[PDB]
Amino acid sequence: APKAPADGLKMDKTKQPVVFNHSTHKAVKCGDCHHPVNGKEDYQKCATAGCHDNMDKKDKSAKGAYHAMHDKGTKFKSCVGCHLETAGADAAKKKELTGCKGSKCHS
Ligand code: HEM
Ligand code: HEM
Ligand code: HEM
Ligand code: HEM
Structure with missing residues (x-):
């Protein structure tokens, strides 16, 4: 393993x-x-060649790295998608776990 x-x-x-x-x-x-x-x-690594190696943050294909970490409705939960479910209706947790700035992911 x-x-x-x-x-x-x-x-x-x-x-x-x-x-x-x-x-x-x-x-x-x-x-x-x-x-x-x-x-x-x-x-x-997620951005290995042939994996999520499209570094254009508007790409929505299976190669788009931004898409794979930030978007909802993906085949596997993304970082942000899972965190949204975790936070629920708790706006403080939404800011901490899903905020674009001043969050646990981005300062
Ligand atoms: C579960 C116990 C589990 C294992 C095993 C595992 C392994 C693993 C390895 C070996 C790496 C390093 C890859 C490399 O060669 O650099 C790695 C890296 C990342 N992981 Fe992981 N991982 C386990 C669990 C989880 C879980 C549950 C998540 C998602 C919530 C996750 C995510 C990541 C991420 C992101 C990386 C960094 C990859 C990158 O591109 O640098 N892992 N993991
Ligand atoms: C690294 C830990 C890693 C992450 C994070 C990740 C995320 C991810 C998501 C969220 C999707 C779904 C996107 C959608 O729009 O539905 C997804 C899909 C695929 N990925 Fe991935 N992925 C990580 C790692 C890797 C690696 C290392 C590769 C390449 C070997 C890779 C490839 C792909 C492919 C292909 C898809 C589509 C799969 C399918 O069954 O449709 N990912 N990934
Ligand atoms: C995707 C690569 C990914 C990132 C990045 C990420 C980050 C992250 C941070 C920074 C925290 C805060 C704690 C810490 O600093 O380690 C955190 C916490 C939780 N996460 Fe996460 N996370 C990523 C992916 C995922 C995915 C795909 C899930 C669920 C399937 C998930 C879940 C959680 C949970 C639960 C926590 C704890 C929440 C809390 O309130 O502290 N993350 N993650
Ligand atoms: C809020 C929805 C939010 C935004 C907006 C955002 C933006 C952002 C940018 C602009 C990048 C760089 C993209 C590029 O290629 O130039 C980026 C990168 C990562 N992010 Fe992010 N981000 C937002 C929120 C979050 C949250 C809450 C997390 C963690 C759950 C997160 C994670 C990531 C990860 C991982 C990356 C890639 C980091 C790297 O490899 O350099 N983002 N984000």
């Missing part, structure tokens, strides 16, 4: 880098994030 890496991982393909902590996500199954591709959970 692949092992979860250390906390403090920087996602840094963009000018708005974000820190990802596996430990705060330990209740989520690994494969919900490292989702199947060709029938096998894929543990490569």
Whole structure:
């Protein structure tokens, strides 16, 4: 089995880098994030060539990196999509977990 890496991982393909902590996500199954591709959970970096390697933040294809982290209605819950469900009607949690600035993802 692949092992979860250390906390403090920087996602840094963009000018708005974000820190990802596996430990705060330990209740989520690994494969919900490292989702199947060709029938096998894929543990490569999300923006690997052929994966979410389209760095145009308006792209909505399966290659759009922004889309994969921010949008609702995706085949796997995105970072923002899952956080919206988690926050519910709690506006303070919405700001913390889904805000575009001054949130836990973006300062
Ligand atoms: C579940 C226990 C689980 C495992 C196992 C796992 C592994 C894993 C690895 C090996 C990496 C490093 C990939 C690399 O080669 O750099 C990695 C990175 C990320 N993970 Fe993960 N991961 C597990 C669980 C989860 C869960 C539940 C999520 C989503 C909430 C998640 C997400 C990520 C993200 C994002 C990264 C960074 C990838 C990037 O492109 O740098 N993981 N994980
Ligand atoms: C890295 C942890 C990672 C994330 C995050 C991620 C997200 C993601 C989402 C949210 C979707 C659905 C988008 C939609 O519009 O429905 C999605 C879809 C696909 N991904 Fe992905 N993905 C991550 C990692 C990887 C890796 C490493 C690859 C390439 C091997 C990859 C590829 C794809 C493909 C292809 C799709 C479409 C799959 C389908 O069943 O339709 N992703 N990803
Ligand atoms: C997608 C790569 C992704 C990111 C980025 C992300 C970030 C994140 C942060 C910054 C926190 C706050 C705690 C910390 O600093 O680690 C946080 C918290 C929760 N998340 Fe998350 N998260 C991403 C993805 C996902 C996905 C796909 C889910 C659900 C399927 C999810 C869930 C949660 C939950 C639950 C928490 C705790 C909420 C709380 O109130 O603290 N995240 N995430
Ligand atoms: C609020 C809906 C929101 C906005 C707007 C937003 C914007 C944003 C930008 C402009 C980028 C860079 C895109 C580029 O290629 O230039 C970016 C990148 C990431 N974001 Fe974001 N973002 C918003 C909210 C959130 C939230 C609440 C999270 C965490 C749950 C989050 C996550 C991410 C991640 C991950 C990236 C990629 C980081 C990297 O690889 O550099 N965003 N976002």
